[PDB]
Amino acid sequence: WRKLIEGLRCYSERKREDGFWNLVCRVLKLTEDLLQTTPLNIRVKQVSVTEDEIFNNNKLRSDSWKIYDNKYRQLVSEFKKSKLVKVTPESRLKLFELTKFDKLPQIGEKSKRGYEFCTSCGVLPAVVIMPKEDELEKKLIDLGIARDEKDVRSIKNMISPGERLCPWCLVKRALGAEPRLMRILLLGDLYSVEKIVNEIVSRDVKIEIPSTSDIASIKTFEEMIEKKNEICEDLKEEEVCEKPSESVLSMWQWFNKNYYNGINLTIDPEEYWFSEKRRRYYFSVFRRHRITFPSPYYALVRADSDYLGDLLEGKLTPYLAGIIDSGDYANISEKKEEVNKLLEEY
RNA sequence: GUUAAGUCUGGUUUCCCUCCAGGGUAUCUAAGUUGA
Ligand SMILES: Nc1ncnc2c1ncn2[C@@H]1O[C@H](COP(=O)(O)OP(=O)(O)NP(=O)(O)O)[C@@H](O)[C@H]1O
Ligand SMILES: [Mn+2]
Ligand SMILES: [Zn+2]
Known part of the structure; x- marks a missing residue:
C-alpha cells in the first residue's frame, strides 16, 4: 500500500503541471x-x-487421509468466528484532534461547519473541497485549487464542481486519472517503484473509463454511428462526430470495438443530451433523425454463486439448496434421507 | 134447401273461442408506461 502511494506521489511530482496532478501533489504532502x-x-x-498427525513413524496412517478435511474445517471455523466482529477501515485512523481542533488540511474551500464529509466516501472528512458550479475560476484561483485558466479545465476534468474528497477517495481519483500506477502493486518485488513511474511518464496513454451516463447512452451512441455523416452534417461542429484526436483506448470492450466509427465516444452525455442548457437542441436533433432519445437508466447486474463456501467444504447445501439448510448440519442425523439418496447416487 | 165472408200467427234461444307452443341456438369481447 505505501509503495503504491509513494509511487503515486513521485508520478504526480513528475507532473507539476496539468493542475489536477499539481493539486494531488499539494494535498498529498499535507495528508x-x-x-x-x-x-x-x-x-x-x-x-x-x-x-x-499424519504418520505412524514410517508411513501414512488411517484417518490421515481425512486430516485435510479436518484442518480446512478448523480454518473456516475460525474465519466464521472472527467474522462475528466487523471493524471498519476508517476506525483505524486518528482524527479526534484533526476534527476537534481544525487541524485538517482544508485545501479548497472552507467549511462553515467544522469540516466537510467526503462525497465519495461518506464517513471520512474531506480534504479537497470543490466550489459549486456557479463561478469556479474566480474562486478556484483565489483559493488553492488551481494556478491558471488552463489547469482548471484539467482539475474540472476529474473533480466535478462540488465534489468533496477524503484523502483515500482523492487517492482513488488520482489512481483513476491514469490507472497504470497499478504496476507498483500488480508486479511487486520485481521492478523498482521508479522503473514503473519512468515507463509511464515516457509512454503517455490516457484511458476513458465509462460513467453511468455513457452506459445509459449506449444505444444512443450506437444509433448515431449508423448515421455517421447523415447525422453529422446536422451538427458537424460540436466534436461529437469529429476526429479521434489521440489514441485513447479503454477496457470497455464496446467502447473499444466502436471507437473508429465516426462518432467520438469520449463525450460526456451529461454535457450534450443530459445537460440542462443543451438537450432541447439535442431533442430536436434526435427527433429529426429517428433517434430514440436516451433513457437515464442503466442496469447494475450483480451475481454471487450459491453456497460455494459449503461446496469447498464438500457440504451438500450446494446440491440441495433450501431442502438441506446449513443449520441442518449441526445435527445431520435428522435429514438422513436426502443426503443418503444423493450421496449414494453420486 | 139458400146468402155472404174469411179471420188470427209471420223465427226465436244458446254457443262468440278452447288447449299447447310465450322464445331456442351461436357469438359473451377481440385485436394493441415515454421523457426530464
Ligand atoms: N471457502 C471459500 N474459499 C474462497 N472464497 C470463499 C469461500 N467461502 C466463501 N467465499 C467467498 O467469500 C464470500 C463469502 O460470502 P458468502 O455469501 O457467505 O459465501 P457463500 O458460500 O456464497 N454463501 P451464499 O452466497 O449466501 O450462498 C463470497 O464472496 C464467497 O465467494
Ligand atoms: Mn456466494
Ligand atoms: Zn472518500
Missing part, C-alpha cells in the same frame, strides 16, 4: 500521516499440522 493507514484491512488466519 501523509493520515494516508499512512491502508484503506482496506485484512484478516489472516492460519492452522498447523505436524507429523504426530
Whole structure:
C-alpha cells in the first residue's frame, strides 16, 4: 500500500503541471500521516499440522487421509468466528484532534461547519473541497485549487464542481486519472517503484473509463454511428462526430470495438443530451433523425454463486439448496434421507 | 134447401273461442408506461 502511494506521489511530482496532478501533489504532502493507514484491512488466519498427525513413524496412517478435511474445517471455523466482529477501515485512523481542533488540511474551500464529509466516501472528512458550479475560476484561483485558466479545465476534468474528497477517495481519483500506477502493486518485488513511474511518464496513454451516463447512452451512441455523416452534417461542429484526436483506448470492450466509427465516444452525455442548457437542441436533433432519445437508466447486474463456501467444504447445501439448510448440519442425523439418496447416487 | 165472408200467427234461444307452443341456438369481447 505505501509503495503504491509513494509511487503515486513521485508520478504526480513528475507532473507539476496539468493542475489536477499539481493539486494531488499539494494535498498529498499535507495528508501523509493520515494516508499512512491502508484503506482496506485484512484478516489472516492460519492452522498447523505436524507429523504426530499424519504418520505412524514410517508411513501414512488411517484417518490421515481425512486430516485435510479436518484442518480446512478448523480454518473456516475460525474465519466464521472472527467474522462475528466487523471493524471498519476508517476506525483505524486518528482524527479526534484533526476534527476537534481544525487541524485538517482544508485545501479548497472552507467549511462553515467544522469540516466537510467526503462525497465519495461518506464517513471520512474531506480534504479537497470543490466550489459549486456557479463561478469556479474566480474562486478556484483565489483559493488553492488551481494556478491558471488552463489547469482548471484539467482539475474540472476529474473533480466535478462540488465534489468533496477524503484523502483515500482523492487517492482513488488520482489512481483513476491514469490507472497504470497499478504496476507498483500488480508486479511487486520485481521492478523498482521508479522503473514503473519512468515507463509511464515516457509512454503517455490516457484511458476513458465509462460513467453511468455513457452506459445509459449506449444505444444512443450506437444509433448515431449508423448515421455517421447523415447525422453529422446536422451538427458537424460540436466534436461529437469529429476526429479521434489521440489514441485513447479503454477496457470497455464496446467502447473499444466502436471507437473508429465516426462518432467520438469520449463525450460526456451529461454535457450534450443530459445537460440542462443543451438537450432541447439535442431533442430536436434526435427527433429529426429517428433517434430514440436516451433513457437515464442503466442496469447494475450483480451475481454471487450459491453456497460455494459449503461446496469447498464438500457440504451438500450446494446440491440441495433450501431442502438441506446449513443449520441442518449441526445435527445431520435428522435429514438422513436426502443426503443418503444423493450421496449414494453420486 | 139458400146468402155472404174469411179471420188470427209471420223465427226465436244458446254457443262468440278452447288447449299447447310465450322464445331456442351461436357469438359473451377481440385485436394493441415515454421523457426530464
Ligand atoms: N471457502 C471459500 N474459499 C474462497 N472464497 C470463499 C469461500 N467461502 C466463501 N467465499 C467467498 O467469500 C464470500 C463469502 O460470502 P458468502 O455469501 O457467505 O459465501 P457463500 O458460500 O456464497 N454463501 P451464499 O452466497 O449466501 O450462498 C463470497 O464472496 C464467497 O465467494
Ligand atoms: Mn456466494
Ligand atoms: Zn472518500
